[PDB]
Amino acid sequence: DNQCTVQVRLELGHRAQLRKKPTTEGFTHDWMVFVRGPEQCDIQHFVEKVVFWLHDSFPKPRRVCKEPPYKVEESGYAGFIMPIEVHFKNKEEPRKVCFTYDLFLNLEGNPPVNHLRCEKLTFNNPTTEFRYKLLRAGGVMVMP
Ligand SMILES: C[C@H]1CCCN1Cc1nc2ccc(NC(=O)c3ccc4c(cnn4C4CC4)c3)cc2[nH]1
């Protein structure tokens, strides 16, 4: 009778391409990973920050974006599994969500990578304050 759910959508994705020639350091690939909303949505209303956990080999592997764009642009030798934490402007649980992102590169001779992973987040009975943020972001209220 006082229940609701608010669904919001996140898009995680990455692009990778084999450099025409490797960098001095022998980096073979450029890549970019991101978190975004669908078009006409503003996820910054409910996202405090996004944390991208790069392979321990990278300088400052804990890459924090506190405002859009939520992305990391890098060059590298190899794909890896990237924890991505999306922190919410929520005073209560859940305070964040963690994704395990498959940052895979294109093997020599394959076209560039351009992947998207769509994530629907369902908040059950958010606080008044957090519900407001989710809706401002373009979130959809479902009643029972
Ligand atoms: C454009 C600039 C901005 C700041 C730094 N950046 C250049 C840059 N510095 C870098 C420093 C390190 C790396 N490391 C990798 O690309 C990498 C290394 C080892 C990996 C994997 C996957 N698995 N494994 C282990 C062996 C099994 C990936 C890439 C770097 N790119």
Author numbering: 2 to 145
What sentences appear in the manuscript?
Although the Kac/Kcr channel in MLLT1 is linear and narrow, both ends contain adequate space for ligand elaboration.
In addition to the well‐studied binders of acyl lysine, so‐called bromodomains, YEATS (YAF9, ENL, AF9, TAF14, SAS5) domain containing proteins bind acetyl and crotonyl marks on histone tails. Despite high sequence homology (88 % YD alignment) and similar roles in complex formation, both MLLT1 and MLLT3 appear to have independent roles in cancers such as acute myeloid leukaemia (AML). We have reported the discovery of the first small‐molecule inhibitors and a cell‐potent, selective chemical probe for MLLT1 and MLLT3 YDs.
